[PDB]
Design a protein around this nucleic acid. Structure first.
Lengths: 386, 61, 136
RNA sequence: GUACUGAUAACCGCAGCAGGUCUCCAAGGUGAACAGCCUCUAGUUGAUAGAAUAAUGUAGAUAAGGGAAGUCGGCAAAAUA
RNA sequence: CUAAUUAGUGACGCGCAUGAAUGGAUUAACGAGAUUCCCACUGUCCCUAUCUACUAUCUAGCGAAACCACAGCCAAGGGAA
RNA sequence: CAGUCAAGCGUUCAUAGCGACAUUGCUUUUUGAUUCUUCGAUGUCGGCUCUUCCUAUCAUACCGAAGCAGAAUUCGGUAAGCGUUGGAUUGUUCACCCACUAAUAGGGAACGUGAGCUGGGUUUAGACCGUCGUGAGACAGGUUAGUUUUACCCUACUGAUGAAUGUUACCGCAAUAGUAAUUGAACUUAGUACGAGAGGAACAGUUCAUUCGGAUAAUUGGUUUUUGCGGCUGUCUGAUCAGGCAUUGCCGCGAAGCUACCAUCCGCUGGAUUAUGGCUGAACGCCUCUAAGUCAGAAUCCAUGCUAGAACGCGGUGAUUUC
C-alpha cells in the first residue's frame, strides 16, 4: 500500500555524499569564466577563518520596512595574509579533459613551502628543490624553455601560491599550497604575470573589493560518527519504542530485498567539502592599519580583534576579509574565497554597503566593553591599578 | 546606533546584545544578559545586589 | 494575515501552536482566545500550525460572554511573550500572549486595546493601530 | 549431642546463582518515627582490569513559547506533599 | 458537552433479544476495576537539543551459544505460478 | 477506468458540455471464482516511521477548446519535476465533520514496512449480559483483563581503513554516479483593460513569506561534572578557617562546547525539446505547421554549478638511501 501521508524527504541526495573529505583544504572544482579583455587577476584567495562578530549598518533597499534604518548582521572574519606565488602550471585541452603538461617553480622557496612536501621535517636533510635551483644556475635557459613550452600550448594557466602561515597565530608551521587560475589577458600575458611574480606576494586587496559577492569553499566542521536523527533530520520514534528511538523505523520494502541508497542511514557527520555562493564582502581590512574596527561613524581607534582575542583563534594582525553571514568550516580552518562565477545582479547584490559599527566586545562571554579604555572609563580605578 | 543602559544593573547595552522585555503596563526593560534578566524575574532588588550601578550609587562607591 | 493586512510581515518566531489559549485584549466581552488555526500557515506532516504576533488566527472564545461563545471567529495576535528578533538586532517579549477579535476583513469588533501592542501588528492592521494605546 | 557456617562463598536452587530460607540483641544526631540521610562499636573495602568518551542503548536528568494538539487511552514524567 | 465527538451524560422506548432471590430498581462509603469531562501540571507533542554513570569501542587475560546441503551481487525470463 | 455509433438534451444547434438503445476494450487499488505453492509454521488488522515507483494530474509550469466579454468555471494536451496538511469521534482501513491551504489526487512495492515499534482490534486460557441449548456448551453478538523472543553470521546499505603496479611527497584532471529547489501573499500596474452595470484581471517591477536543503554559533534561547563562584539543610572532623558524605545533596548565576525556523546566513544560468502556435512549401497548378526544410517554446531533458573521485582511470612536479 501507499504512504498514506506525504512528506518531503529528509536530506539532499546531491550531497548524499557525507563522507570525510580528502583534506582540510577543499578543492575548487570551477574557477570563474575567462574574459581575456581584462587585466590579469587571481580568481580566488586563501585565508583562515578567525571567527564571527556583529556589524551595524544602514540598509539601502527602497520598498522595505527597514529601509534607511540600522540593522545588525552577523559576519565572518577571515585572516588573509598576502599569498605568495611560487609556481605556474599549464593545462592543455584534450578530448579527455584538462591535462597539466608543465609546472615551473621559483628559484627560492621558503621553509613554509618546503615544509609542505615533508611528513617529518625535523629529521630531514631538507633536500627539496635543491637540484631544481640548478636550472636557475646556468643563466635561466631551461626555465625559459619550459615557460615557452607553456606559452605555445596550455589553454588555461594556473598559479601555485601558498600561504604565509608564520604571520597567522596558529601553531601550524607547515603552509598550504594551492593552484589559483589566472584570468585576464592572453596566455602569454598570463604566464608573463606568473613569471614576474615568482617569490613575490599578492595581497587580498588586489583580488577583491568592497561590496563584492564571493563564494566560500571549505571543509565543514566535523563531528564524528553520528546517528540518523541528527545526520539526516528524521523524526524521532515515540517513547514506547523498544530497542531505540533515535532510529529510522522502516528501512525499506520487502520487494526488493535490498536496502536502498536513498534511505537515511547513520554514519559520518561533518568534515564535508562545501561551497557556498553569494556572500557579500563587507570589509577589506589592512594589517598595516590600526583602527581596523573603526568606522566613519564610530571613529574610535580599535582593531577588529575583540577583547581577549578571537576565541580559539588568536589575534588578527594581517589583512582580513570581513564577509556577511556564515561560512562553512570552523575557526582556524583554511578557506578558499572565490569570485562569483556568474554576475549576481539581484539587488541584494550591487548594494553599496557602509558600516556604522563593528562589535569588538569579548566573545569569551557576555562581553560588554568594546575597548579596555572604555572598561576603565566605566569601572574606574581598581586594586590592581596604579 | 544607540548604546542603551541596563534597567537592572546599569550596564551598557550595545546594539544586538541582550534582551528587551515589555511589561503589562507597557514599561520597557532592557537587559544586557540573561544574568540580570533572571535576577529581575526573581524579583530581586538592584539596590541590594552588590555589583549593580544602583548599589554603587546608594553605597557611595 | 493576507486579506486586509496591507504590507508585509517579516518572519518572527512562532510562539502559539494550535491549542494555545491567549488572553483577550479588546472590550468585545471575551476573556481568552483559543487558537484553532493560523491564516496563511503552511503544510508539513505533524507540524502544528503555530501563531505569532501580527497574524490573523481562527479562534474560539472559551471564556467570556455567551454571545461570543461556541463559534469560531478571526482573531489578531497583538502580544506574543515568545522572544522574537527584529531586524535592528534586539530580542523582545511581552508578559502574555494576547489577541483581539476581528472580522476576516480586519476590522476590530471591540473598540479599545488594553496593554501594549507590538508594532508589527499595528503597521500591518491599521484598525488595530487606531484602537491601540501604547505601541511597544 | 557440643567444632564451624547459618548464607551476594559453607543450606536449597546442575554453580562460589542479584532468587529462596525461622529467630534473639540493637548506640548518637535530625526527625512523630525501628522512615530516609550522616556518624560510634564491630565488620568489610569483595564483584576481571587499563585507555578513550563515536553511534545506538540502559539508568538519571534539564528544557525557551505553547500546554495533551501526541496517543486506543495523559502510558511515562511533571505537578501536589 | 466541542470549532468539529461512531466517545460521554440526560431524556425518549413496539425492548431483534430489559425485568423482578436466573433476583428487579436504587444506593452513602470503599476500588492498583471500566469510561467521559474539567482544573493543575508537564519534552506525550510542535521539535528537537544537551549533560552524567555504565555499556557498546580499543587493549591484557578468560572465553561460549544459536544456526550451518553447499553457500552468498543484481534485473528480467521461465519454473512447484 | 477508457472508447466507438448517435435517438435526443443543450431557446436555435447531435458531438461547447452531455448523451439513451447498443457495442469494443483496458486495470488488478474491489469482491468473487479456483486450489497451483506453503500446515517438520513465510508472524494477524490498523496506526506510527521511512524510502522508492506508477499515472488513470488535485495543485504548480506552458498550452488548446468553450454555450471563453471580465472574474469565476468547465472540457482536453504535454507533463510524476514538485508538493499534497492540522484536528474532534471511532481499534479502525472506510467514514464523517471542523479549519487552514496553492492543493488538501488516486494507487503499488509479500493487501511495502512486528529480529522497526505499538498492541487498541481480531483470535487461547479468567469473567459478565442477551438469545439459543435439558445439559456440557454455542454465537460470522455486546463487554472487560490478558508475557510481542534472538542478529555476534552472509549479502545489501551507511560510514571507516587498506596489500599490490620502483619508493616517497605535493599539486591536479575527470570517466562515472548522484543532484534541488519550492510555492504563495502584499504593494504597484489598476478600480485599468473588459463590461449597460454589477463587478473586475494579467505580463513587467518591488518587498516579504511557505515547504525543503546545505552550513553556521556574532547575538538570543536551551543544556551544566567548568562540580567555576556563591547560598542552604542534615550530619561528621572539639571550636574557627577549611572540608567529607547525602550514588552529581539541593538552589541561583554560569563561561566554553554542542545546539534551535527557539538563532543567523546562503540556495546558479545556458542550450535542446514535449504539448502548442507559426514560416516557407509541395503532394493535390489552389490550400495547408510537414511531406523535405524550419522559427519559438513546459516546473521537462542535457549541460553550467554542487558532492564523491574509478581503492586494477590518467597527468605534472620534488627528493630519490652508500658500510
Amino acid at each position: 500500500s501507499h504512504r498514506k501521508y506525504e512528506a518531503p524527504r529528509h536530506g539532499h541526495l546531491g550531497f548524499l555524499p557525507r563522507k570525510r573529505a580528502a583534506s582540510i583544504r577543499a578543492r575548487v572544482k570551477a574557477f570563474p569564466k575567462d574574459d581575456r579583455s581584462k587585466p590579469v587577476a587571481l580568481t580566488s584567495f586563501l585565508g583562515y577563518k578567525a571567527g564571527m562578530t556583529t556589524i551595524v549598518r544602514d540598509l539601502d533597499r527602497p520598498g522595505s520596512k527597514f529601509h534607511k534604518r540600522e540593522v545588525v548582521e552577523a559576519v565572518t572574519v577571515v585572516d588573509t595574509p598576502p599569498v605568495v606565488v611560487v609556481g605556474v602550471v599549464g593545462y592543455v585541452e584534450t578530448p579527455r579533459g584538462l591535462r597539466s603538461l608543465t609546472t615551473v617553480w621559483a628559484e627560492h622557496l621558503s621553509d613554509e613551502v618546503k615544509r609542505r612536501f615533508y611528513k617529518n621535517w625535523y629529521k630531514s636533510k631538507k633536500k627539496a628543490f635543491t637540484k631544481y635551483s640548478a636550472k636557475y644556475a646556468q643563466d635561466g635557459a631551461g626555465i625559459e624553455r619550459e615557460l615557452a613550452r607553456i606559452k605555445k600550448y596550455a589553454s588555461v594557466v594556473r598559479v601555485l601560491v601558498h600561504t604565509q602561515i608564520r604571520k597567522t597565530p596558529l601553531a601550524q608551521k607547515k603552509a598550504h599550497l594551492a593552484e589559483i587560475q589566472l584570468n585576464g589577458g592572453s596566455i602569454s600575458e598570463k604566464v608573463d604575470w606568473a613569471r614576474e611574480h615568482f617569490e613575490k606576494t599578492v595581497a587580498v586587496d588586489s583580488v577583491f573589493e568592497q561590496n563584492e559577492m564571493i563564494d566560500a569553499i571549505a571543509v565543514t566542521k566535523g563531528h564524528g560518527f553520528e546517528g540518523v536523527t541528527h545526520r539526516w533530520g528524521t523524526k524521532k520514534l515515540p517513547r514506547k519504542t523498544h530497542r531505540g528511538l533515535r532510529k529510522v523505523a522502516c528501512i525499506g520494502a520487502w520487494h526488493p530485498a535490498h536496502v536502498m541508497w536513498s534511505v537515511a542511514r547513520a554514519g559520518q557527520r561533518g568534515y564535508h567539502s562545501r561551497t557556498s555562493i553569494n556572500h557579500k564582502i563587507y570589509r577589506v581590512g589592512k594589517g598595516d592599519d590600526e583602527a581596523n574596527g573603526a568606522t566613519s561613524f564610530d571613529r574610535t581607534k580599535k582593531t577588529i580583534t575583540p577583547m581577549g582575542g578571537f576565541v580559539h583563534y588568536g589575534e588578527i594582525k594581517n589583512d582580513f576579509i570581513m564577509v556577511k553571514g556564515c561560512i562553512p568550516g570552523n575557526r582556524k580552518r583554511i578557506v578558499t574565497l572565490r569570485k562569483s562565477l556568474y554576475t549576481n545582479t539581484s539587488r541584494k547584490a550591487l548594494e553599496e554597503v557602509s558600516l556604522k559599527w563593528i562589535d569588538t566586545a569579548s566573545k569569551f562571554g557576555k562581553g560588554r566593553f568594546q575597548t579596555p579604555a572604555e572598561k576603565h572609563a566605566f569601572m574606574g580605578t581598581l586594586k590592581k591599578d596604579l | 546606533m544607540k548604546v542603551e543602559i541596563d534597567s537592572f544593573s546599569g550596564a551598557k547595552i550595545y546594539p544586538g546584545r541582550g534582551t528587551l522585555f515589555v511589561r503589562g503596563d507597557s514599561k520597557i526593560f532592557r537587559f544586557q544578559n540573561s544574568k540580570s534578566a533572571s535576577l529581575f524575574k526573581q524579583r530581586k532588588n538592584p539596590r541590594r545586589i552588590a555589583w549593580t550601578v544602583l548599589f554603587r550609587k546608594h553605597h557611595k562607591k | 494575515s493576507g486579506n486586509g493586512a496591507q504590507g508585509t510581515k517579516f518572519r518572527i518566531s512562532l510562539g502559539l501552536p494550535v491549542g494555545a489559549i491567549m488572553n483577550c485584549a479588546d472590550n468585545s466581552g471575551a476573556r481568552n482566545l483559543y487558537i484553532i488555526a493560523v491564516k496563511g500557515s503552511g503544510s508539513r506532516l505533524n507540524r502544528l500550525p503555530a501563531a505569532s504576533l501580527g497574524d490573523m488566527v481562527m479562534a474560539t472564545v472559551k471564556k467570556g460572554k455567551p454571545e461570543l461563545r461556541k463559534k469560531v471567529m478571526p482573531a489578531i495576535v497583538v502580544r506574543q511573550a515568545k522572544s522574537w528578533r527584529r531586524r535592528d538586532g534586539v530580542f523582545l517579549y511581552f508578559e502574555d500572549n494576547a489577541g483581539v477579535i476581528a472580522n476576516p476583513k480586519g476590522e476590530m469588533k471591540g473598540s479599545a486595546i488594553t496593554g501594549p501592542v507590538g508594532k508589527e501588528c499595528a503597521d500591518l492592521w491599521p484598525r488595530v493601530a487606531s484602537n491601540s494605546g501604547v505601541v511597544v
